[PDB]
RNA sequence: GUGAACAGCCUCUAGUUGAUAGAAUAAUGUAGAUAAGGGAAGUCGGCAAAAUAGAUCCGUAACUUCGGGAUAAGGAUUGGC
RNA sequence: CUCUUAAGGUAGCCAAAUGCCUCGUCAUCUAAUUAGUGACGCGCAUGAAUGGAUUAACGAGAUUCCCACUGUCCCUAUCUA
RNA sequence: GCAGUCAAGCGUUCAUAGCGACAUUGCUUUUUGAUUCUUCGAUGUCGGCUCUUCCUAUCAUACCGAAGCAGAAUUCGGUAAGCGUUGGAUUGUUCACCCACUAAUAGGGAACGUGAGCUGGGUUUAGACCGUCGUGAGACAGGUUAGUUUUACCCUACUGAUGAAUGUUACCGCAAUAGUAAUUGAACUUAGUACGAGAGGAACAGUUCAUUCGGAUAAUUGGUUUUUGCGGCUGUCUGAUCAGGCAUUGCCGCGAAGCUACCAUCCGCUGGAUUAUGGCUGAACGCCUCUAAGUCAGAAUCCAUGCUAGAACGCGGUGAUUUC
């Protein structure tokens, strides 16, 4: 997860490390999520922070709006392409990875979401909820 | 607890089997093992498989 | 002069030496705390280990996510048939630790036991315990009065039992005897109690039960001779390391100059005793039943047995204890299950389980069916049958 | 024979079948392979490896000594009958 | 205008394989650059066949970055001789 | 580099909450100097990687004492090294610098730990280009580019593995000694509560998860494929067919079994005794005082429980013990 959040959320099997780009979900102008931080992340030496669905990521990005480039941004993944097991004993996983922008609390800077997106992340983030399309 | 139908081979999925798959609309896909997910994958069709 | 980055050492020092355990049976080194104020029972149960499945169930945990929800869960089922009482044994407290003070055996002890004394079975005059059976002659005597010498001192009464395995898939057949623990009350009663049992049987279900948390004494599944990487977790050399990679580079500093007990190096991976604690009980299955597999609410006659046998390992005859999750040993290899040596109140501990489904599909493939009705119901009819 | 081909791969005539051997298949190697999700975060440094690749048709920028650059880049096609 | 010692650095070019200070200053590229590039120049100590500046084409030369790529790595596993 | 004594002064008032000038006593041996004792019939010379262990002058985490401690936050100090102490951009760098996460991103040693462990980027041969210097040959901890990293089969140490002799052989055990392990964060609730003008704004109990570590495990999902298990493909060879050989496992799809992954799942015990400190009774001193005698509470500490080995010169209980 992050902080801001409301709850907590069953370990998912880790699919982003630093330096993975996925896409983004939202209105807010922004092709490309570029993750450079994960903050749940604890220490291990050679360890790649990595994040998974509905964690909080710092992020920048890395292809759209020129007034949106070059900083880095707090960001919420929705959607993960690594295979994770939830505990009804299921395997899923979804076709990209996704993120939505959005603010330290959790509120996302747009208001929309294109794609469907995972419950776990869903039900930890209100705001991103609120936005949701088809959820998982 | 239901049992579920793989979607590409008509197969029975139980508890804890195969794999679900999410497609980029909200289509939701269910194998029963690799075997048909793979074929799946492949862009295979199922009306020309002799066994599903 | 000190370490550029600061990571924890790989692997834990408590579990030393990594070499093979002295026997393939792992010692029980502690039983439950005696309260001499209830039935006398035993503390731990033989066993073999036959195989894994898995669980549906409701999970009942107020304030989690998924309280009233269905999870599934993997499950081993350890073969358990009745064990077979043939003596006691008595310790006395002494200032140099307990002591076995006298051991009685049975009248009559059964083949499968005898064989556990001889190596050459076949060709021998299998002279076991001939000559110690005629103590039963003279009326009493020889017995009773050791029967009474562990009355009298004797701090502690072990029972000797050994596993029916006959009554199992097994091709071994020598049995595996072990003492256990008597914890009901007075140590007068708990020899009584282990006389009126001599050649008798004991089952598992007046030993655990539903619910119940118990722990895993086994030795673990052998692996010989292990490099650095795997036995010890180990980060891996690059790949331009002349002479290999798959070391550790700096097996010591210059001072001491001795390599150190510590550091990791290459030999025995597996067969390692191990104790694994709180393995909650899913199932006492009865043998005689045909239903092991099934559920008030999955309501057909199945055996816990699935399509094709347990894999390297065949049927399950007899009672059978279903744990959650997995244990130490694999499939054949003997197994003792202890009870606690605490009063595990957790909640986790304390939730009463009722399992919705029994997986029963082939391990021996990606099963498709659970039964041969099933199967055929199914698939329709074949050129095969009919 | 395949094919552009004295290439690679298979063959005929001819010539070899000779380079101690047996039993196992621990570690660590040397040589040959593959890996879910991420994609250089490894490293002095993409070292090593991986990706491209024939042919037909389409398409092809700056710059330039006007000769080049150029298979630039980027596409579609390919069996059998 | 003057002195050393004959002249007194022109055309050009640069923190350049030549700049000490120095990780130079500004700009650019990055989340962040003792790196790269574009600039600036009182340049410790650039500079005109002791050749200076430009330069298409070529390079198993040195150097930066992008795309593709991938067990380099996260973090290891498995197989064959 | 680190720590003291004194107290002018700072601190609205007030030397000492937190500091502290002028002076002055020391400690350290990761700096750098000084020396030249050892090594010049040679102790591989930097950094990184990897791994272990130690020091405490403690950054985090436990329990405290103090404040210019209202709360929240912080700071000063004690017992404390039990346990952690990271991912990156630039540089050969050590060092430094910025981004970022974090409970915290503490400082040092072990031949400036660690080259028959790696790597070889820099320095440190011979090639070559510069600038400065020199008439020149050549020189310049100045810039630049290319420049071979050898041996273990011995002894010991360490990891694991057998094993003669204690009448024989077998089974079941004891436990001396040695090892030992767990870690840290958040959310719900307490509670918008205590406190506070406000702005703000905790904690214990209870509940749910997560991080780092460890030990097993293979039902599930995934990886792997000489199952050369099934099928598909190219080329050639067996006259065709069927069925096959060859192409260092010819290539492709699937592929059981085994092995195996925070890529998978399960599991990681609870008593006592103490430390700092706060106290009880209580003199010394007819008062006072936690201390002198006696005593209570009390920590990630320690000792047991528990977990691993089992002394091959520590032990106990038990079975059978030879006519060819
Ligand atoms: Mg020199």
């Known amino acids: ?136 | 607890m239901k049992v579920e139908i793989d979607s590409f081979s008509g197969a029975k999925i139980y508890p804890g089997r195969g794999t679900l798959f999410v497609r980029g609309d909200s289509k939701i896909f269910r194998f029963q093992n690799s075997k048909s997910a793979s074929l799946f994958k492949q862009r295979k069709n199922p009306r020309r498989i002799a066994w599903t | 002069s000190h370490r550029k980055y600061e990571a924890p050492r790989h692997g834990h020092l408590g579990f030393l030496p990594r070499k093979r355990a002295a026997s393939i049976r792992a010692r029980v080194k502690a039983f439950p705390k005696d309260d001499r104020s209830k039935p006398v029972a035993l503390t731990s149960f033989l066993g073999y280990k036959a195989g894994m499945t898995t669980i549906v169930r409701d999970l009942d945990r107020p304030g989690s996510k998924f309280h009233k929800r269905e999870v599934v869960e993997a499950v081993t089922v350890v073969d358990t048939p009745p064990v077979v009482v043939v003596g006691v044994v008595g310790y006395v407290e002494t200032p140099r630790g307990l002591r076995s003070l006298t051991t009685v055996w049975a009248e009559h002890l059964s083949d499968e036991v005898k064989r556990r004394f001889y190596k050459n079975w076949y060709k021998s005059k299998k002279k076991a315990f001939t000559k110690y059976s005629a103590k039963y002659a003279q009326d009493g005597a020889g017995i009773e009065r050791e029967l009474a010498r562990i009355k009298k001192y004797a701090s502690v009464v072990r029972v000797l039992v050994h596993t029916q395995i006959r009554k199992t898939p097994l091709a071994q057949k020598k049995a595996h005897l072990a003492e256990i623990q008597l914890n009901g009350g007075s140590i007068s009663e708990k020899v009584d109690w282990a006389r009126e049992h001599f050649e008798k049987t004991v089952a598992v279900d007046s030993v655990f039960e539903q619910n119940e948390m118990i722990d895993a004494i086994a030795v673990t599944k052998g692996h010989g001779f292990e490099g650095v990487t795997h036995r010890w977790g180990t980060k891996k050399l690059p790949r331009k390391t002349h002479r290999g990679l798959r070391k550790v580079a700096c097996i010591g500093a210059w001072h001491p100059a001795h390599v150190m007990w510590s550091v990791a190096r290459a030999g025995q991976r597996g067969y390692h005793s191990r104790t694994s604690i709180n393995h909650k009980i899913y199932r006492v299955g009865k043998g005689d039943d045909e239903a092991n597999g099934a559920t008030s609410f999955d309501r057909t006659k199945k055996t816990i047995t699935p399509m094709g046998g347990f894999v390297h390992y065949g049927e399950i005859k007899n009672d059978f204890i279903m744990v959650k999750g997995c244990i130490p040993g694999n499939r054949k290899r003997i197994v003792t299950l202890r009870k606690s040596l605490y009063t595990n109140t957790s909640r986790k501990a304390l939730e009463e389980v009722s399992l919705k489904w029994i997986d029963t599909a082939s391990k021996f493939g990606k099963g498709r069916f659970q039964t041969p009705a099933e199967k055929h119901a199914f698939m329709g009819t074949l050129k095969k049958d009919l």
């Open chain 1, 1 to 136: 997860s992050g902080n801001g959040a409301q709850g907590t959320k069953f370990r998912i099997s880790l699919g982003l490390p630093v330096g993975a780009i996925m896409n983004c979900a939202d209105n807010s102008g922004a092709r490309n999520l570029y993750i450079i931080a994960v903050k749940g992340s604890g220490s291990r030496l050679n360890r790649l922070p990595a994040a998974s669905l509905g964690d909080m990521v710092m992020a920048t990005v890395k292809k759209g709006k020129p007034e949106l480039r070059k900083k880095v941004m707090p960001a919420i993944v929705v959607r993960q392409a690594k295979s994770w097991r939830r505990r009804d004993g299921v395997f899923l996983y979804f076709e990209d990875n996704a993120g939505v922008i959005a603010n330290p609390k959790g509120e996302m800077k747009g208001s929309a979401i294109t794609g469907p997106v995972g419950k776990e992340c869903a039900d930890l983030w209100p705001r991103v909820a609120s936005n949701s399309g088809v959820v998982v």
